[PDB]
Design a protein around this ligand. Structure first.
Ligand code: 818
Ligand code: 818
Lengths: 107, 107
């Protein structure tokens, strides 16, 4: 599944609802901290909606537990990410992923 | 993992080696037989190589057990396919997939 560990607290009152646009900043890493991608590097947040298979399941379940302004680490098991296949030439088979995510706003 | 059930036998001697081009015909279905895709419908075989993350793991492990001319049903568990996410708007979360595959030739 997914484990959420909070780095900085959110407002504790505004949680994402299916159908809302989530705006975030993320950094993706392997369990040893090796970085594979970051929206921060591109200077552009990533936007997605819950409930439309727009993101891997670990995000669908992890982001729903965050409130606006929260910064958290999401640890995602392989089945909730790229499973036994991985992602071609970036993520190996059976990898648990770690994402540092910040929920900037809901729109 | 993956289960291979043979419909028509292969030559029993030519098995795919990593680095070879596999040429196949396939039909993808859910466990109840509902078809989601088929190369047969397009009149064009599908070509891929083992060992390059070009296909879901259930195929990487299942096709390697087939010999040229064999026709088999591959039953693939979710982690060896699209896991808890599925494939956007085609395959639901946690689905076991069934592929009817025919190994036409190796090149
Ligand atoms: C068509 C292009 C479209 C690309 C964009 C919108 C780009 O803007 C995004 C910034 C994507 C990033 O591009 C730089 C890049 O992000 C990674 O680096 C990454 O950090 C990651 O894991 N992320 C991205 C941040 C959210 C979680 C996760 C994801 O859910 O990503 C999604 C993902 C790949 C889902 C698979 C879909 C097929 C399912 O079957 C499978 O189910 C197992 C899951 C991704 C958002 C797709 O929905 C949409 C796209 O692919 C991926 C390793 C590879 C990916 O590039 C492709
Ligand atoms: C860039 C376009 C490129 C498209 C082609 C070469 C097309 O010619 C192929 C005929 C693909 C088919 O297009 C009509 C179509 O096939 C499905 O319908 C399907 O039956 C399927 O499941 N197949 C296809 C036959 C081999 C097994 C499996 C697969 O391995 O497919 C691979 C797959 C999606 C892997 C994911 C990669 C990201 C990983 O992270 C993730 O790991 C979980 C696994 C597919 C071959 C990709 O490598 C390459 C592409 O996507 C998919 C449901 C969706 C897919 O369209 C995308």
């Amino acid at each position: 599944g997914v484990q959420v560990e909070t780095i900085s607290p959110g407002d504790g009152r505004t949680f994402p609802k299916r159908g809302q646009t989530c705006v975030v900043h993320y950094t993706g890493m392997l369990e040893d901290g090796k970085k594979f991608d970051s929206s921060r590097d591109r200077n552009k947040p990533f936007k997605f909606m819950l409930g439309k298979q727009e993101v891997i399941r670990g995000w669908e379940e992890g982001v729903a537990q965050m409130s606006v302004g929260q910064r958290a680490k999401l640890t995602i098991s392989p089945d909730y990410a790229y499973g036994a296949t991985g992602h071609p030439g970036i993520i190996p088979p059976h990898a648990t992923l770690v994402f540092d995510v910040e929920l900037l706003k809901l729109e």
